[PDB]
Design a protein around this ligand. Structure first.
Ligand SMILES: NC(=O)c1ccc[n+]([C@@H]2O[C@H](COP(=O)([O-])OP(=O)(O)OC[C@H]3O[C@@H](n4cnc5c(N)ncnc54)[C@H](OP(=O)(O)O)[C@@H]3O)[C@@H](O)[C@H]2O)c1
Ligand SMILES: *P(=O)(O)OCC(C)(C)[C@@H](O)C(=O)NCCC(=O)NCCS
Length: 514
């Protein structure tokens, strides 16, 4: 019986279990979920994706049910789109005929054009890091106009989904909580769902209603994971983007804001990475391999291609925003992206108390060189994306949301600033000696701190990074649009400063991550 194998495999893996238990409640995470996924895949000879195992809507019973369903026999797959066993993927593989039904595609070019006034916005990924502040930014604009923000969140039912979303605004900041509750009760609608499933995992009546009522879609949701392979991210990030596009191409046209990533530039020559070019020409072929964030980069690229196809077929207006590292909120306390690579690094440096002399390549004489960290704080990013996205009722344009300043503000300045603020971090001169001692210290930390540390991403720091000031990639469409729209206090992309970095240490203490 399938549930028995599911139970026993979980017990053996995690050192324990009830069929109503959730994998994460038993000590599971996204990486032990990969081990679990591969184990069950080999036993039952069916796909058992990580997403099925880790979804907040699913328990072990749900995993067993998924296996039973697959064993007795229609969604797009890696195999049906790219060909089974393929180690390279092409933009030409990703055609809309393989994701959307013929009737939707035939009717799409003649659909009514976008509404002149945006009153209702559908937002994906709202309980995520960036999405929560995109939700807030839309609520601030729309509530005073009698408008609505609808949000799809994973959960067992609408009540559980709402609870998950509410909890991300509880971080020890009274002003944040008050502001959220004020706006949410007036303008927020929360639906349990899943954008990798048909009809976005919704009740049919809700999906039909959204096809009629929604004026604009903000697609911020994705499985953001730097270790998982492309096959595991295909469902949430590629099929998911196609499901969002389907809604945008039903009943009437709905402009789409799509979140992407600097990782789509991997494998492309910086001079050839055209910020506002056609992504199908810029990156026509990509390889699947063991490189850092390869699967993630590929998955987000694939979504861009599909949306570009949707624009060319139906004139669907799209704005893509390729993010760098989206850093902490500069006002709201306890608000930082806890699982991101940067937060993990800062936490690890504070916890271990040791940093290298430089994170970057030394010069010929062994001296520290000028370097830049490609990061933008979320409060700026959320305002920029919302403003520029609202202006995107026509055409297709892309933005590189990277920090282009040749300001010499990088990881070594951040360590200096933490030391000047009173945090004991000693400098180890040899990078390879630091990296070795850093790893040892990390393994000696208590389990909670070690899991929150940079340990599972340490392979990104195998070599010192190149000493680059500014960004290698084009940023001029983003920078100039941000200057013209006069965004924030800067009327420009911000510089990262001492206040922001010291706030990381304060937020880490406030959340009890230590
Ligand atoms: N850069 C791009 O910028 C965007 C924002 O990044 P971020 O740092 O905010 O990511 P993040 O914090 O990891 O948030 C990801 C969001 O997407 C949601 N999501 C994932 N799979 C889903 C599914 N199948 N159905 C519905 N929701 C799903 C997550 O919900 P859960 O909490 O249910 O995982 C979460 O709300 C991403 O698209 C990223 O690729
Ligand atoms: P799992 O969810 O336990 O996976 C652990 C992880 C370290 C692999 C995962 O948290 C991860 O990939 N973190 C980095 C996320 C990140 O840096 N996001 C923002 C830049 S795209």
């Amino acid at each position: 019986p399938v549930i028995e194998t599911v139970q026993r495999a979980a017990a053996a893996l995690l050192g324990a279990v009830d069929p109503e238990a959730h994998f994460s409640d038993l000590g599971g995470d996204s990486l032990s979920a990969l081990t679990y996924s591969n184990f069950l895949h080999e036993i039952f000879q069916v796909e058992v994706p990580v997403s099925v195992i880790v979804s907040a809507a699913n328990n072990l019973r749900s995993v067993a049910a998924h296996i039973e369903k697959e064993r007795s026999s229609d969604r797009p797959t890696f195999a049906s789109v790219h060909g089974a066993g393929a180690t390279t993927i092409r933009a030409s593989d990703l055609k809309l005929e393989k994701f959307l039904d013929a009737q939707t595609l035939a009717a799409a070019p003649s659909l009514p054009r976008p509404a002149s006034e945006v009153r209702t916005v559908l937002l994906t990924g709202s309980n995520g890091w960036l999405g929560r502040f995109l939700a807030l930014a839309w609520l601030e604009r729309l509530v005073p106009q009698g408008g609505k923000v609808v949000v799809i969140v994973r959960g067992k039912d609408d009540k559980a989904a709402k609870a998950r979303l509410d909890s991300v605004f509880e971080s020890g900041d009274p002003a944040l909580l008050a502001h959220y509750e004020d706006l949410a009760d007036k303008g927020l609608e929360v639906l349990a769902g899943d954008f990798s499933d048909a009809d976005l995992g919704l009740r049919k009546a809700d999906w039909d209603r959204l096809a009629d009522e929604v004026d604009l879609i903000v697609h911020s949701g994705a499985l953001v994971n730097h270790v998982l392979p492309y096959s595991q991210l295909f469902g949430p990030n590629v099929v998911g983007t196609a499901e969002v596009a389907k809604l945008a191409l039903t009943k009437r046209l709905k402009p789409v804001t799509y979140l992407s990533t600097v990782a789509v530039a991997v494998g492309v020559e910086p001079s050839a990475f055209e910020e506002d070019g056609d992504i199908r020409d810029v990156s026509a072929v990509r390889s699947i391999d063991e490189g850092y964030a390869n699967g993630y980069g590929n998955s987000k690229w694939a979504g861009e291609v599909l949306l570009r196809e949707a624009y060319e077929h139906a004139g669907l207006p799209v704005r893509v925003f390729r993010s760098d590292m989206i850093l902490a909120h500069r006002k709201y306390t306890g608000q930082l992206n806890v699982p991101d690579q940067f937060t993990r690094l800062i936490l690890s440096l504070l916890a271990t108390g040791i940093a290298p002399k430089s994170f970057y390549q030394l010069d010929a004489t062994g001296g520290r060189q000028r370097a830049h960290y490609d990061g933008i704080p979320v409060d700026f990013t959320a305002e920029a994306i919302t403003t520029l996205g609202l202006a995107g009722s026509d055409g297709y344009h892309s933005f590189d949301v990277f920090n282009p300043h040749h300001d010499g503000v990088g990881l070594d300045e951040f360590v200096d600033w933490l030391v000047e603020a009173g945090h004991p971090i000693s400098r180890v001169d040899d990078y390879a000696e630091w990296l070795s001692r850093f790893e040892t210290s990390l393994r000696g930390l208590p389990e909670a701190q070690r899991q929150h540390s940079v340990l599972p991403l340490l392979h990104a720091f195998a070599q010192p990074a190149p000493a680059i000031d500014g960004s290698p990639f084009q940023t001029k469409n983003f920078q100039s649009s941000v200057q013209e729209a006069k965004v924030g206090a800067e009327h420009d992309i911000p510089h990262l400063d001492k206040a922001l970095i010291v706030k990381y240490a304060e937020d880490i203490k406030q959340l009890g991550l230590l």
